[model samples]
Target: VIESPVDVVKELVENSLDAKATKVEVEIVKRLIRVKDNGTGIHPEDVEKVVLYSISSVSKFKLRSRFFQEKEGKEIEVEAGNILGTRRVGMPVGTEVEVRDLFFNLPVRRKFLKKEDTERRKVLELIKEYALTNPEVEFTLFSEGRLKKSSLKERVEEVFQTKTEELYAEREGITLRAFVSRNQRQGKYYVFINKRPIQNNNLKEFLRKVFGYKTLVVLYAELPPFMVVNILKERKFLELVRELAGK
Candidate 1:
């Protein structure tokens, strides 16, 4: 039931979040990568679906609307019973959104993929950014192609041991921290919502306002437990954050 590499990643990420893991670690070796989390492990019955399914009915409606509105920055007025436990708000019972981006985009279709080394490097960078945002959660990275086996703890000192002085000088809020690999490029950004990493022009524009124009950053926001309920009416909150970040 594995749809693709990205699908596998998405499932693992969801499982980790459901487990209440504040941190998740990822590693890759050839085409086989492992995602490990210290959150609540899967119930025996759910393991199969965790490893195979595209969507879960049980996950559709749980959190409340206020949570979503707060995180997304919009005022979504929706009935609790109607919003929770439903897939796609009003879609048919079994409808599933088709994933056609990385799985079918030009680069994916053309088979003009970059060298394995390059792809691995990018993945590592993503891991590092996520670790910084979730400083309370420990993260580690491993790759056979890369020489260093790196581990990052929740502490800023441990995660940014060498960059402590630079980070202090910059004076970003303590809750918001960052780390860049020694050989990494600057100005690249990645965003994730509810543990589902996504790239949307609107989101990117919002982030740029928050982090600033000269910043190249990867952001992982720990969504509150209640965000799913207000998904539709939270755009204003999202926009507000964008404005506050000076985007």
Candidate 2:
């Protein structure tokens, strides 16, 4: 189950990336979330499957996009988990999804949510993490009326706000690339396994022991696809981390 508003944003953004989107825009308000991407549009036949996959906790989900074979875009609406309608619309090649009234059907979940500002900040932090790992993809975030846009080489420097030391090491078939800044005292750490974001507490504890609690550490690890599925439990992965951290 999704834990918070930040989780919603994370899933949506990952979906965009999965669609091969090079540019993604995310807008968040108190109770609504919208993600627009210039990725491959959903096939008209797959609209239901896509909506069914993503509309479990949303009150209303609207998808609009132009498929490769179409001259203009088509739109689909789903409310209360039922398809309302589908129609043709004018648009460029891409997809836009709007999720309104998150957790509206679950009163207890809504009651447990943090303040809007707190949730918004978490979403921003999540975006920053994605930006760091996917430096080739442009990310734009909007909160209320404020906007932040970033991409490319300066991502690491911009996010950490301080110079970083590039760290690298390879063990067997795994490779680890990291940027660390001891001067940044925010205690931020990010780990991406095979280009996907993951939280490894085991690695985090090791990072804390070696780099202290306030260093900004961003790292990406790559291994065979088969290894990635179980890398967290694989000692070799941890050994690679140890080697990279020089522990």
Candidate 3:
């Protein structure tokens, strides 16, 4: 159901934030991707639930994380014989996902994947986007076991290459706190809804125009789940946000 390894990275990271993790780490090796979070984790017993839920999808995906298929047989509720592969130690209360050989079963898909450097950038960029939106959390990214430190800057330096200006606007149930470039000639920007990054071209472009130059802005919006769940309702409410955004 996912496109590339990067999609899986996004899903896993989003899952971490959903678990309310304050710290996250992502690592990408040649053909392996590992993500870990110090958030709430599955009970050792309920761990089987995630496997059973996604077990049927395996037929479509030849790729499965090591946790799913390391062991062959043991008494279990899953039809997959032994789930949770190898584990005896008390598992920590957090989540870790490792994806190996993405799209290995589909030659065409593998062929289309960009070079390691390029794919690595895609993965790092996803982390950067999420990190930009959620400065309250700490993020560390790695490629092939090498930590990506320089690329990760303090949320201040993380935005624009220059000094940053804070944007704060709130109304009713929505509160906006953003960091934008002081004089937008450069830098990347991102948007988040409840700390989950999203692509909202309208909001992005509008903010770009607001800054009056090429801007690096991260907009974090807090909305009542009810109204924001509907696209139209969110958009109408979002425009209200745009009006009061960088003012």
Candidate 4:
């Protein structure tokens, strides 16, 4: 059974991300779920609109990427470099596409969704992934199903208990660690460049190349901080990184 409250928390984190918040906290009691964020909280005036629409059209492009495709195999990756003489000025891929189209082109794996408890647990796991990626931002998840509330002090420590050891071992030089979590299993890891996430095989390949065999399954990677700075200079690269970080 999907008795776990983790899935609900995942959705809440996504909502917080869309709200442009740096930190997100979640609490779950039985069937009830509550998520609070220090992020730009829902504007009191816009609360109605937010509740009614849930998804904002203006924020649509911000969430799109080359990785997300439409039916008929059409590439929706935004081509802003061509439109705006400025290489960096561009919208996210598939911004103008309808929500129905976006969901339709994707797999219908939800049909096989597990019971409520199981799904909730998955959500909690997803939250841990977010906690690891966003160390600067405090992340917490409270669930009654699992027991008492479980809190993660930092991103690396929350998801991977041994991450601190790894970081300590590699503390000799400048290092950059980036984390990304998704609802799905595959394609869960994404690239963030210039504060935008993009689906670039080259970037993943680059991470793979740099990390080599040292990369852990749960702990994705550790890169030189300078490398991230250098990559951010390229508009596409920055977008990819931002996307990964959910900035």
lDDT of 3 by residue, 1-247 (tens): 5667788778778878887788888888867776777676554555555655333222122112222222221122222223434444433456666666776666887788888888888887788777676668788887755423233335656434467667677767777777666555464567777756667676667766765556667667777664342253566556656675536
lDDT of 1 by residue, 92-206 (tens): 1111121222323234432654566876666665665455445556566667633222344434345434332221111222122233223333444555454445577766676
* Candidate 2 wrongly placed segments (more than 4 Å): 147-154, 225-247
Candidates sorted on TM-score, descending: 2, 3, 1, 4
Best by TM-score: 2
- Give a tens-digit lDDT track for model 2, residues 144-219: 7763555577578776678888888887788888888887647888877777777878777787776678888888
| Candidate rank order under lDDT | 2, 3, 1, 4
Candidate 3 clashing pairs?
none
Q: List the pairs of residues colliding in candidate 2.
A: none
Q: Each prediction's TM-score against the native?
A: 0.42, 0.82, 0.68, 0.41
For residue 118, model 1's alpha carbon misses the true position, in angstroms, by 2.5
Q: State how far residue 174 of model 2 sits from its true place (Å).
A: 2.5
Candidate 3 wrong stretches, greater than 4 Å: 53-93, 145-156, 159-162, 172-174, 183-187, 193-198, 225-246
**Model 3, residue 239: C-alpha shift (Å):** 7.1
TM-score of 2: 0.82
Q: Which candidate model has the greater TM-score, 2 or 4?
A: 2
Q: Against the true structure, candidate 4 has what lDDT?
A: 0.40
What's the lDDT of the predicted structure labeled candidate 3?
Answer: 0.62
User: Which runs of model 1 end up more than 4 angstroms from their true locations?
Assistant: 1-7, 51-113, 145-161, 165-247
